């Protein structure tokens, strides 16, 4: 397995509903601290990486 | 209309609760018991009340919630039902399907038990309120209902799904009656045109039982902001 495949495996490992998108609740679990700091991290990830603003990070958005 | 999923006003399994037993971003109260795959909002014990409400208010011009639930009981008759909420204040405990009375906003009541004996249950009722009206429990809110449908949402082979849409000042309730696992088999239930509701509000879900008691399980509450 390549690194990129290892990254894909993490993406898929937190895609519990199998829709090939990671939402904020799925992202939260990946962060296995207060609810306010958690909100700020997740909002941060969405702000920076959710390019189409649908509330999901798809694999393309995940890869960069 | 563009949809944006809103994680802060949502919950679902398979990791629905944190290690301390709480639902991230939501408060729960009364007899509601969250577990990693669902929240048993009100179990099939006598006189139960439970609720789950968002910690913060949502400020969306248009929105859509998808709630997946199951209301299960021994009898062909069960009680009392479940409520989906958008309201100014958190109604964590109270006599209205487990939540506070005198709410400001809208309740969508999935009422199992025919308190007035009109043989018109289970029923889905949409009741707006401005902070002053006492829910008419004994008449299943019939005089307070802006709209309603008859729909047996109990004891179904698959989880029932309700889609509640607030778009361009119309509130629409679509119901997937749980006869199949196809998530998108929604049928129209009821709608209110020209409805105006607080600009900001908590989302919530609650349930209760009485002498008769169903289990009221909610598997997921998923909120989307709609733009256009
Ligand atoms: Ca997903
Ligand atoms: Ca996206
Ligand atoms: Ca009733
Ligand atoms: Ca009735
Ligand atoms: Cl989860």
Curated annotation (Swiss-Prot), chain A:
Where is it localised? Endoplasmic reticulum-Golgi intermediate compartment; Endoplasmic reticulum; Golgi apparatus
Q: Where does Ca(2+) 2 bind?
A: 50, 52, 54, 56, 61
Chain residues that bind Ca(2+) 1: 15, 17, 19, 26
Occurrences of domain EF-hand (ranges) = 2-32, 37-64
Q: Which domain of life, per UniProt?
A: Eukaryota
Instruction: Using the UniProt entry, name the condition the protein is associated with.
Output: Factor V and factor VIII combined deficiency 2: A blood coagulation disorder characterized by bleeding symptoms similar to those in hemophilia or parahemophilia, that are caused by single deficiency of FV or FVIII, respectively. The most common symptoms are epistaxis, menorrhagia, and excessive bleeding during or after trauma. Plasma levels of coagulation factors V and VIII are in the range of 5 to 30% of normal.
Assembly and oligomerization? Interacts in a calcium-dependent manner with LMAN1.
Job of this protein:
The MCFD2-LMAN1 complex forms a specific cargo receptor for the ER-to-Golgi transport of selected proteins. Plays a role in the secretion of coagulation factors.
The domain-related comment in the record is: Essentially unstructured in the absence of calcium ions. Requires calcium ions for folding.
Q: What is this protein called?
A: Multiple coagulation factor deficiency protein 2
Q: Which organism is it from?
A: Homo sapiens (Human)
Q: Span within the entire protein?
A: 67 to 143 of 146
Swiss-Prot record, chain B:
Q: Where in the cell is it found?
A: Endoplasmic reticulum-Golgi intermediate compartment membrane; Golgi apparatus membrane; Endoplasmic reticulum membrane
Q: Which residues bind Ca(2+)?
A: 111, 113, 115, 140
Q: Which residues bind a carbohydrate?
A: 47, 80, 115, 137, 210-212
Instruction: List residues of the L-type lectin-like domain.
Output: 3-226
Cite the record's tissue specificity text: Ubiquitous.
User: What does the UniProt record tell us about how this protein is modified after translation?
Assistant: The N-terminal may be partly blocked.
Result for mutant: residue 26 to S: In F5F8D1; loss of interaction with MCFD2 and ability to bind D-mannose
Show the disulfide pairing.
Answer: 149-189
Tell me, how does this one assemble?
Exists both as a covalent disulfide-linked homohexamer, and a complex of three disulfide-linked dimers non-covalently kept together. Interacts with MCFD2. May interact with TMEM115. Interacts with RAB3GAP1 and RAB3GAP2. Interacts with UBXN6. Interacts with SERPINA1/alpha1-antitrypsin. Interacts with BET1.
What does the record give as the function of this protein? Mannose-specific lectin. May recognize sugar residues of glycoproteins, glycolipids, or glycosylphosphatidyl inositol anchors and may be involved in the sorting or recycling of proteins, lipids, or both. The LMAN1-MCFD2 complex forms a specific cargo receptor for the ER-to-Golgi transport of selected proteins.
Disease annotation reads:
Factor V and factor VIII combined deficiency 1: A blood coagulation disorder characterized by bleeding symptoms similar to those in hemophilia or parahemophilia, that are caused by single deficiency of FV or FVIII, respectively. The most common symptoms are epistaxis, menorrhagia, and excessive bleeding during or after trauma. Plasma levels of coagulation factors V and VIII are in the range of 5 to 30% of normal.
Protein name (database record):
Protein ERGIC-53
What is the gene name? LMAN1
What is the covered span of the full protein? 42 to 269 of 510
């Amino acid at each position: 397995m390549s690194p990129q495949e290892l990254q894909l495996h993490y993406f898929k490992m937190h895609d519990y509903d199998g829709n090939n998108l990671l939402d904020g609740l799925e992202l939260s679990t990946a962060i296995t601290m207060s609810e306010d700091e958690l909100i700020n991290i997740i909002d941060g990830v969405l702000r920076d990486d959710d390019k189409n603003n649908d509330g999901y990070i798809d694999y393309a958005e995940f890869a960069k | 209309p563009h949809r944006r999923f809103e994680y802060k006003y949502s919950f679902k399994g398979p990791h629905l609760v944190q290690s301390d037993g709480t639902v991230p971003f939501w408060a729960h109260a009364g007899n509601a018991i969250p577990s990693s795959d669902q929240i048993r909002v009100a179990p099939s014990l006598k006189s139960q009340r439970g609720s789950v409400w968002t910690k913060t208010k949502a400020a969306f011009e248009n929105w859509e919630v998808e709630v997946t639930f199951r209301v299960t009981g021994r009898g062909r008759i069960g009680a009392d039902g479940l409520a989906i909420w958008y309201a100014e204040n958190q109604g964590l405990e109270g006599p209205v399907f487990g939540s506070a009375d005198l709410w400001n906003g809208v309740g969508i009541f999935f009422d199992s038990f025919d308190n007035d004996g009109k043989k018109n249950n289970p029923a889905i009722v949409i009741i707006g309120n401005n902070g002053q009206i006492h829910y008419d429990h004994q008449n299943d809110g019939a005089s307070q209902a802006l709209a309603s449908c008859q729909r047996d949402f109990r004891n179904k082979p698959y989880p029932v799904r309700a889609k509640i849409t607030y778009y361009q000042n119309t509130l629409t309730v679509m119901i997937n009656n749980g006869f199949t696992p196809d998530k998108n088999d929604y049928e129209f239930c009821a709608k209110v045109e020209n409805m105006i509701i607080p600009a900001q509000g908590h989302f919530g879900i609650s349930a209760a039982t009485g002498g008769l008691a169903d289990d009221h399980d909610v598997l997921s509450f998923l909120t989307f902001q709609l733009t256009e």
